[PDB]
Design a protein around this ligand. Structure first.
Ligand SMILES: [Ca+2]
Ligand SMILES: [Ca+2]
Ligand SMILES: [Ca+2]
Ligand SMILES: [Ca+2]
Lengths: 223, 226
DNA sequence: GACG
DNA sequence: GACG
């Protein structure tokens, strides 16, 4: 274990103005902080297919809408139900120093070490979040936090279970034979991610501990 | 209007170790911050009964579990699904200065003025939160914030809708009267905060009007205990 | 009452 | 791939 046992997993999901090729900006951020004990206490899914796991009783949640500096791409606005104009009309603030202070205080309430988990996080959420934080004078709140990509995790878990798309929805439906709800809301998709990570909680925690890496090593999506 | 038009309503719900006579401590806190426009964006249904309204798309959320400094009362533990032992196994921190810093930073993201809305808040959540903040070595982040009790609000809205002494204004009683459905996730902070949001979305314009007329400073809320 |  |  490169960094010991992770005591908190923080499921991260972002909405944004678009895809990496577009130099996107964040428009919504959700964190679900779950203690490793809560994950390892998830009851063993029985049946075929198993029911969607119940979220743990104890889950710290932070869900925020964020005004971007540029317009949302048409597809992004359609699927997320957000737009720059409506966010501004409702007085949503930019990704700013106060937000970094907020994140710091929320992270500080979680037992360490702590590991972010995001779906395709290594190619999307982590680099994007690194870019957003790099714009601020405030030192990054994530410099002591770890991260892993849940696509890699589920590939490993599924591989061990049965020696295929790994999109969030494809996995959820494969595991549970249900359709994800509130797709492309940061909280809806974060909850779906939590559910897939609860499919085999012990195995997931084991993989996370083995593959956690410092968020400080994530390269910004763009400069 | 005593304090202008409220730009954000923050629906507040707490779970705690017990009821007032027990000098309770907070074990869970949820804030749902909704811009006044967002409440107004609620689609108007003309069904009878109307369907439970969708929450607005834009709603900032903060939901936190908090370890108390004494055991939960057995009744509170059963009702809430929380216990000091389980909060502690899961590494929850106390209601401390960092929590106030977190609350302060969250409140700053909301367009001002903000008005807290809690069900029986005048007799429970507001005095309890005032008590918890008063223990800290950091300034309360609520001295520039306003508050109202949704029991008074719904009594007023229901009376105006059908010109009340013979009914309950408990959270679930109102919800069922308006929507003919049972509330879900009762006695979780977020679950009941969402139920409260739904009852406040029943008649959004009338609710906002009443809130503007009755908002009072949180700084004037007397602590539950000292 | 109504809040846990 | 898969992320909005
Ligand atoms: Ca995502
Ligand atoms: Ca998403
Ligand atoms: Ca309550
Ligand atoms: Ca409650």
């Amino acid at each position: 274990l490169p960094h010991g046992h992770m005591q908190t997993l923080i499921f991260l999901d972002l909405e944004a103005t678009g895809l990496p090729s577009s130099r996107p900006e964040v428009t919504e951020l959700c964190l679900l902080a779950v203690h490793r004990r809560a994950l390892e206490n998830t009851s063993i899914s029985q049946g075929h297919p198993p029911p969607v796991p119940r979220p743990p009783r104890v889950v710290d949640k932070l869900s925020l809408c964020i005004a971007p500096g540029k317009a949302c791409s048409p597809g992004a606005s359609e699927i997320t139900g957000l737009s720059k104009a409506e966010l501004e009309v409702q007085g949503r603030q930019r990704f700013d120093d106060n937000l970094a202070i907020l994140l710091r205080a929320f992270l500080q309430r979680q037992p360490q070490p702590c590991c972010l988990v995001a779906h395709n996080g290594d190619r999307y959420d982590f680099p994007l979040l690194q870019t957003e934080l790099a714009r601020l004078s405030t030192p990054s709140p994530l410099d002591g936090t770890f991260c892993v990509d849940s696509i890699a995790a589920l590939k490993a878990l599924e591989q061990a279970s049965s020696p295929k798309s790994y999109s969030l929805g494809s996995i959820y439906t494969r595991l549970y034979w249900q359709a994800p709800t509130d797709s492309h809301t940061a909280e809806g998709d974060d909850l779906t991610l939590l559910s897939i990570c609860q499919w085999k909680p012990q195995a997931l925690l084991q993989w996370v501990d083995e593959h956690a890496r410092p968020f400080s090593t994530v390269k910004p999506m763009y400069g």
